[PDB]
Amino acid sequence: MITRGEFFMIKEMYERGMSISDIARELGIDRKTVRKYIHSPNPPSKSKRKQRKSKLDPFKPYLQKRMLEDGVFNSEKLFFEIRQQGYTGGKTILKDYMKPFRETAKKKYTVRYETLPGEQMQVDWKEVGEVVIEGKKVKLSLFVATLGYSRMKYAVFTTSQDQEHLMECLIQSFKYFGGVPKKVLFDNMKTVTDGREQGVVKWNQRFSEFASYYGFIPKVCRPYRAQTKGKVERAIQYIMDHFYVGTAFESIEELNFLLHRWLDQVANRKPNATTGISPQERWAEESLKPLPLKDYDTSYLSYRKVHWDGSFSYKGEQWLLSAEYAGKEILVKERLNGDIRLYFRGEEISHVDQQKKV
Amino acid sequence: MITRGEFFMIKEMYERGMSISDIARELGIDRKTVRKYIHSPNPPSKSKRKQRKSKLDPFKPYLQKRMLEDGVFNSEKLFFEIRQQGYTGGKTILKDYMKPFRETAKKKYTVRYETLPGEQMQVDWKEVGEVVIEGKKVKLSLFVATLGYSRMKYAVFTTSQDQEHLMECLIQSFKYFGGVPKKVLFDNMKTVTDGREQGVVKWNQRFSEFASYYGFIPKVCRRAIQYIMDHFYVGTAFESIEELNFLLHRWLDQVANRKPNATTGISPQERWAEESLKPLPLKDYDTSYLSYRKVHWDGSFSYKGEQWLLSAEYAGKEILVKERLNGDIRLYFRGEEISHVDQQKKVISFAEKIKKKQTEMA
Amino acid sequence: MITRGEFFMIKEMYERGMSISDIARELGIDRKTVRKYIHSPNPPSKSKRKQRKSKLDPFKPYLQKRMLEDGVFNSEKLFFEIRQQGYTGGKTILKDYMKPFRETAKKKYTVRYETLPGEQMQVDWKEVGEVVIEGKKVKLSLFVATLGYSRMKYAVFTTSQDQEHLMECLIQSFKYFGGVPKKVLFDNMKTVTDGREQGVVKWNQRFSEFASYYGFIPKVCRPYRAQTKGKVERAIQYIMDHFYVGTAFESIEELNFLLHRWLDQVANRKPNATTGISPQERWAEESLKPLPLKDYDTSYLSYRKVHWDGSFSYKGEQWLLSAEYAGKEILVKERLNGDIRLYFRGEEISHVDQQKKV
Amino acid sequence: MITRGEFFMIKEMYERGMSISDIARELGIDRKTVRKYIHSPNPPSKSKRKQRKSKLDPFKPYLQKRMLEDGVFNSEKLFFEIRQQGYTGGKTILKDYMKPFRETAKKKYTVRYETLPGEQMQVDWKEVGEVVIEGKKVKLSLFVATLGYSRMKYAVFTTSQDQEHLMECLIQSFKYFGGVPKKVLFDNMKTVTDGREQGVVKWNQRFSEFASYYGFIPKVCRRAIQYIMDHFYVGTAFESIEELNFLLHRWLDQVANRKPNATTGISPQERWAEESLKPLPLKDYDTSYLSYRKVHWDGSFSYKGEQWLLSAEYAGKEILVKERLNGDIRLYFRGEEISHVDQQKKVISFAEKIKKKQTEMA
DNA sequence: CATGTCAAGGCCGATTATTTTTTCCCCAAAATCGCCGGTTTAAAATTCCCCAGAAGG
DNA sequence: CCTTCTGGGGAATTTTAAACCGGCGATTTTGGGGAAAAAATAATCGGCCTTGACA
DNA sequence: CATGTCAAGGCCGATTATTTTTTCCCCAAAATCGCCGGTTTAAAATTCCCCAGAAGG
DNA sequence: CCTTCTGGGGAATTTTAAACCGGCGATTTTGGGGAAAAAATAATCGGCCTTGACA
Ligand SMILES: [Mg+2]
Ligand SMILES: [Mg+2]
């Protein structure tokens, strides 16, 4: 099959009026081919034909069943399996036929969705790994909060993912935004959800009362479907692939301060690809309504019996309580920072006098 | 030879009643020349001399080989070579014998032929300069087609010199001139040929399809632009590209294609009127930008910064996004055209399209 | 610069004896270029020149320090970092310069080694994942043993990686091979090693006495360097990428039997790439010396006080012991399979009479 | 014209003492023709007639354009065209005027020229059949070079028709013939040109370097093999390829290159003796298979099934593994040659090389 | 002594089978080209009258 | 002193050569059908090289 | 209501700067080609003697 | 009856035409140097599209 140059030359020659024989002689082409290409508006082209039958055709349904349902993409395993079924072919066929399927595996169809301003705050955790601070190992964890409409990323590094730490980071994110969105999206975790009841979302009483105090509602997604919170997950693959990779830190406060400056610099004002607008100039389009702060900092610790005069001794210091506690046993809760609380039957004692009779 | 009139007179005198021998004695010519020319059926014209043998006939095949394949026309190199091969002649013979072939070879370079009606259309490009459209700089380009015979010029401003703009401007030129010419010749450029090797050219696929659809043949082989720029663009007021093209076409119709040449004294209009352009097809070629685009598994496929969302039926596949020069986008999936999605000519954020599809589906 | 075709044509024409001017006219090339190419044994070529200076050159040492020591390969992070240092360039330079480094990162140089016959048996574990058998979840684990010289892979699926299970699988592999190699290579695990002592390999007393009983020596590799046992690790990436992917099983014995048949079919006789010889025809070139089998199947369970007559009751059945145990408390060890043992002060009682007085 | 002898006699008679008027009266020729031819310095030869005007001179440029660019030589198409353009003549004029150009164009196809000494070497390939070497089948191929002038044939058996075998066999042919010819012409094949487009050819890089190192030029343009196979290979006993090549060269030296042609009556040996081959360079080209190979980070890089181990200095890089046809392997890393690793011609397992390096390093 | 290894997938090349395209051969019909002879046109040559110079009555 | 002859120039006609036109014979070209060969595309089989994954 | 998303890397194209190659113009020198005239060679034509046929003394 | 003239054939020489050789004049070609333009390679900057990763 001659190429486009020869066809254009032939058309030129005939339009010039030359004899077919002279065209054939000069172009080194037969006269009949010249004739064919005279009256042919279609120039030479690859002209792909229809795929014909193949040795693998009768086995293709089984190959598809193995590939999709079972999930097999090893060329030789399927070759061995179908050799027992009468396959009289080689392995390159199987590799070539399977290449598209293995290239397009574990990929479903997904529905893109955007929510309304101030009505979806995605929140997620991440165990970054193991780091050494002051010679002591710690399992550091990112906590990330992304506002759905504005994509206003906020992140904080913590040492534990306890309920108290979760609530503290959530409040920090809220005051960072300036308001509490009505719906907060989370993942299936013990703190957020006690469990499941026949596919019914369940939330812990503590978290429910916390949210009622702060006027938001959890909206945990489908179990085992963590793709739902794509915003926060990709905000976590941005922090990790832009900030942590190459970060030098010595103190946790230093790292958090580095992260917040990095956020305000590039993470909160870089024009988002999908929205095309900087997050900071859409962070003011979300309804806000803040509230004061509260916490439940407590640790189950030693007890002390209160004398009949209302005085009890702790670490050599004298503490006086109301006469109602005289003769009863109380729980003294001292944290590593020196904060001291007193409890009785699980209720915090709000009135305490510290008489420094050392 | 001898006078023909003498031969005819001798024949008549023999037929007059005079003995041949007496004729020979009187005329001082033998009786047998008289006898030979008496039976002459026709007058003795130029003697038939048969291929007088020369002094280089044996080497004629060698010299022809040299000239026609080796290409050597000097009369000294080959003179020495034939001397080595046993040549007993001189130089004038070789010079005279090669002179026809020498002039034939020279004529290959004296290309001073005239283009005949409808034969070829010469096309030229140009960077007009730098202009600002909607606050963005752009290197606008002039595109000038020129009929070889009528000399008329069709000029237009286009942002890009890409293949699609080339095809659209060729269509416009054919419409303006009322038909198509046999051959269309350009300057060596990527949109036409994918390189050349000094005598042969590798034509493009889409360009060749276009050319054979409009019945012309491309030709990239090895001023009007500068005149247009010096006489129209300089000192011209315009704020729109469409208005500028309108003004250029008006100027062309008034005082460019109707400007008589000093030598010929005829305006281009009459020359075009006496021109032969083959008809133009009933419909026009689809010069829409042809671009294959993979559609992500979420349906979001991006084209020139605009991310369109499709349905799950065609997610994960590659589709041909034909973009018409006007701005309309047509998506074809394995030949089966898909519903024309919203094509409002206002670049909008992808989240807006997410919302649009989310509300439309439900 | 003309191409090879033009240069060859020019050489042809001059060898033919043509004038320089005629060559120039016919080829459409200037006479001086023709002259240059007449006497030039070097034909036209790409002729790559030397790379010149670049805006990024003064910053390249810092980029290399970030890439290798810190380990940063994000284009924009380094762009931002070096923009503050006076970089007046774009980002494509940085991406292009960094592409080779990111393509060749986390790759050291490694020394290939082969050991002598019957002197290295690599052994490793793997937690395959979570599977459901009879409606009950189980954390299945591969145990793989590869003989260094023969590459004679053996594998067994287990439900736990306890010390007893480890020893049982090791013995099964040994009897599969027919002999105990002198050196057995393991990984840093609690069962194999109690701990570390200033970079000194330490082994548990139980495992040490076990190996002495079976006449082999542990040869645990460098800590944190699990690359040392490449043979077993790739034997584990062969089982997973050839057998488990697409395996249907309902009972653990069925799965182990499937695996052993698959081994004997393709895993033990497929010609190894490096050695070029089937493992089965080099499995007979390794020294062997087996020994009988032993185990420590015990479970800490309930106790029973022995009466003064030597009889004690368990689950309604009467058991008689030697008079030495009269009046003492013993430990009855009953497994789920009904195996019953008796212990006293940690020592198993070997003499017991079961009087079925039900 | 009139007789020159008459003019000379008249001049002498006037110089003899006879009045011009009396001469005119006697000869029946005017006195003034006599006067004109009396002062003749040289005899009156062919009259100088100046470019007799024809009936198609205005159209001569058009006809030349048609013939030399359009290529149309028919005397009917152009006859009608010139009739349209106002042609008042006939057909014989056009036929005769084109006959020179027609025969010149025809001569482009009557390629019946003789190859002169040393000019071109015609090379041909062949699949000899199927043979078994060391228990493995192989499609051996014959390679036959042929001098255009001397007609001698150099034939050799090679397993592969790859480029390196081609270069080695060309070197052997040049050594056998004692020099190199100007041009070497092959059949269209991948090892020489990367495709052609009917008039132009894209030569290879290594092949061109080789050709310009041995001072010849390739030429792929558009029997001896079959004779060799029918007269030597049929009914031949051999168990080695080297022995077969030795026997073929012996046969060529005895009764193939010394077999007189019936027509010429001369053996090829004398024709070669009277041949001009340009000298051969002092050294030979390196036709070692050029293959770039990435070296894994463990130093194990594989070539044709053999996995060699290198040192950490060159681990992770790509090296050029030049394989000489003999079997030796030379590794070059960015120009700096590396120590020639063990190259025993016995394919050995990779574990053996692991052991070798492990014991050598320590 | 401590030392990383093995396999799978993809790509390239070669071989075989089917389909499409190109090339070659024979018979019949048509068209064009070349050579020779005759005629026509253009160019060249020759001859016929007046002015000037030289020679002879 | 004068007359005649000769030489040169101009115009017209004739002759010769070249070119042009028509007819005949030979050769070449074009169209259609059949068979064989070559080229292009798709399918099939085996081997080699490099990279990746569990660590 | 429940619905996956965002960024980074690589590639392509365009623009700018530096280096290499190619092309063009002017002056001086050298070589080759073409035309005209003269000479030589080959081919063609013509003329000069013997045999045959026809006509006239 | 016979003699003379005419026609045809063969050979040699001469004439004409074509071709060949040498010299002169004109034109074309080649080599070197300088300047300008174009092409190729390397470097630089911005944008777009697709894929991958934490889930
Ligand atoms: Mg492990
Ligand atoms: Mg998560």
Author numbering:
A (entry chain B), C (entry chain A): 1 to 358
B (entry chain D), D (entry chain C): 1 to 222, 234 to 373
Cite, word for word, the article reporting this structure.
IstA was then incubated with the optimal donor DNA in vitro (i.e., a complete pre-cleaved right transposon end with a 5 base-long 5’ overhang) and injected into a preparative gel filtration column. Despite this movement, subsequent rounds of 3D classification readily generated cryo-EM map with an estimated overall resolution of 3.4 Å. Overall, the cryo-EM structure shows that IstA self-assembles into a tetramer that engages two transposon DNA ends around a local two-fold symmetry axis. The uppermost dimers engage the TIR sequences in cis and appear to play a mostly structural function: the DDE domains in these subunits do not interact with the DNA and the catalytic triad is far (>8.5 Å) from the nucleic acid (the loop present immediately after the catalytic E233 is additionally disordered). In contrast, the lowermost dimers engage the transposon ends in trans (i.e., the DDE folds engage a different DNA end than the segment bound by their HTH elements) and appear most likely to perform a catalytic role. The DDE motifs (D124, D187 and E233) of the catalytic monomers are proximal to the signature 3’ CA dinucleotide at the end of the donor DNAs and thus are correctly positioned to perform a transposition reaction. Consistent with the known metal dependency of the catalytic reaction, extra density was observed close to the 3’-OH of the cleaved deoxyadenosine that could be modelled as a Mg2+ ion (coordinated with D124 and E233). Notably, the division of labor of the two IstA dimers also extends to DNA recognition.
Here, we use biochemical and structural approaches to define the molecular determinants by which IstA, a transposase present in the widespread IS21 family of mobile elements, catalyzes efficient DNA transposition. The IS21 family of insertion sequences is a particularly widespread class of transposable elements. After screening several candidates, IS5376, a prototypical member of the IS21 family found in Geobacillus stearothermophilus that is highly similar to other members present in Escherichia coli, Pseudomonas aeruginosa and Yersinia pestis, was chosen for this work.
